[PDB]
Design a protein around this ligand. Structure first.
Ligand SMILES: N[C@H](CO)Cc1ccc(O)cc1
Ligand SMILES: N[C@H](CO)Cc1ccc(O)cc1
Lengths: 320, 321
């Protein structure tokens, strides 16, 4: 039954999973397994990315796994982020790492790998890219970005990563990796994808466009968080409601217990039932207070004198 | 006048056995603009005297003709190919060894620039993208009817921003340059020019192949004076110039390197006279002179590695044996 719990846990983080079957076998085998997540450093880190990465990582470990955090600095450069400056990209990568630390990521079962350094040390990684690109091309016969990332799950570790833990918006990549693995008789990577937090501006709004307002960043001050929550789209229904989304995907999971509008909640079911009748101004006040408590971990972490250099550089890049 | 450009064109062509179109090379030379050339190699435990001298001679000629040489140290590829069992530290150490040998033999550093693959790949994402794009071209070409070639082919396009003008490699690597040329035509890019040099035959025979199987088939920059004498003494040698490795060493290495050769009691300054007198030369006495001239060249390296600053490199390379 212990393997049943471990299984329900790992599945609690995902909105989608490539065959629960394959995941069930891995959990049942009872053997140490590996999972990974990657990101391209950028000017600022969304609260969603920071918290979800930390919760998922800490969960993998507790469930008997090892986590690999892939810092795709090389790819960020290739995608011209930070106008291609690798030194700025790397500082940003370190900033992200420090944010994960401040938030409690479990370093005992977590390893950080940098793309630029990994690529220079493992030619097979690039070879894997070529082979996947060949598979893809020949397939469509009857863009490389996908093939390049698809190689990650097979090369980050000798036997190949067991679980690819990414956002649901990365679906196409892990699907290719699975197609490829089957056509090459390799171990099939297990996909564990999480929900993509919606914009605070509402369903009619996009994302990353006018993003400053549409999302909370780990560098936002207390006043900025409160103002972004005040402006956020919010109706009396839970569907397409960013306030309900932040509560469900971030706050309840992070804190376990929430005191909302004078009532204590320990499960999303009860919050959903009372949602329509909650005074929304009071709810927003509580939501912003809980969010600010989380970000305070980062604010306090970066007060350490040893991180002043990092902090100053990050701010200058028109970032935190 | 145009005469200077004629000499420049003629000098550049003298280093090659094959040239992908004289037309493209003439235009480049006539343009009068500074141009770039590159040569690449994977570090190895030992370095053939052929590679050492030819790299130095070709490099110095390129520069003398108004060009800039890029020497690409393929350490990354050496590891991928498992040289030294994949140990990157030994590979780079050997890479430094090769460089000190080029320097000992007088390569012109003022017009030469070294670039290591491991570092280049980590700093230039476009390089890898080029490999992928070339691989797609090559795959679609077949489907319209092994990635190692597509990988090396990217070199001429990425080593420098505007792409390298001249690919200067041994003729045994013509397939890679030809791929690059086809690729370049399809994608409308500057067409790379190849200037491929002759591959020296094995001292063991015209049919024998180069391999760690018989280290006697070639002279290495680490061979001792007694060792070269023995290797030359035992080398295959008939009275004809064809299928003769002794003749090849004289033609492609000695005459070009020294300009004047005293062989079997006679002075030679051109290959035709050597060829006409070859059959009647006492071969045992010829081998003596050939071995002596070769040892004079290697003495440059032996002396170079006596410097105290290189005692470290020396010891390391020696241990890798
Ligand atoms: N490409 C993603 C965001 O742009 C980040 C990423 C995700 C997974 C990887 O294996 C690598 C990078
Ligand atoms: N592949 C060659 C010998 O095996 C070495 C080489 C030649 C040219 C390059 O651009 C790279 C490596």
């Amino acid at each position: 039954t212990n393997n049943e719990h471990r299984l329900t846990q790992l599945l609690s983080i995902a909105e989608e999973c490539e065959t629960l079957d394959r995941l069930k076998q891995l959990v049942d085998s009872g053997r140490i397994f590996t999972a990974y997540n990657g990101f391209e450093p950028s000017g600022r880190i969304h609260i969603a990315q920071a918290l979800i990465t930390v919760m998922n990582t800490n969960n993998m470990i507790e469930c008997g796994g090892q986590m690999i955090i892939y810092i795709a600095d090389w790819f960020a450069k290739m995608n011209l982020k930070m106008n291609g400056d690798i030194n700025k990209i790397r500082e940003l990568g370190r900033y992200f790492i420090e944010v994960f630390k401040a938030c409690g990521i479990n370093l005992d079962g977590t390893r950080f790998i940098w793309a630029s350094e990994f690529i220079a040390s493992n030619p097979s990684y690039i070879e894997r890219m070529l082979d996947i690109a060949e598979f893809s091309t020949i397939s469509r016969v009857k863009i490389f970005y996908p093939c390049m990332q698809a190689a990650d799950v097979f090369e980050l570790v000798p036997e190949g990563i067991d679980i690819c833990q990414l956002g649901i918006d990365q679906r196409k990549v892990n699907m290719l990796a699975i197609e490829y693995a089957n056509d090459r008789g390799l171990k099939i990577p297990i996909s564990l994808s999480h929900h993509m937090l919606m914009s605070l501006s509402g369903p009619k709004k996009k994302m990353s466009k006018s993003d400053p307002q549409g999302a909370i960043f780990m560098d936002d001050t207390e006043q900025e968080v409160s103002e972004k929550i005040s402006r956020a789209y919010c109706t009396d229904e839970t569907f397409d409601n960013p306030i309900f989304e932040y509560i469900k995907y971030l706050l309840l999971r992070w804190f376990g217990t929430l005191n909302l509008c004078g009532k204590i909640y320990t499960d999303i079911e009860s919050i959903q039932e009372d949602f329509s009748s909650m005074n929304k101004r009071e709810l927003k006040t509580d939501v912003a207070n809980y969010i600010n408590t989380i970000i305070d971990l980062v604010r306090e972490h970066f007060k350490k004198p040893e991180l002043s250099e990092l902090l100053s550089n990050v701010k200058s890049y028109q970032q935190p």
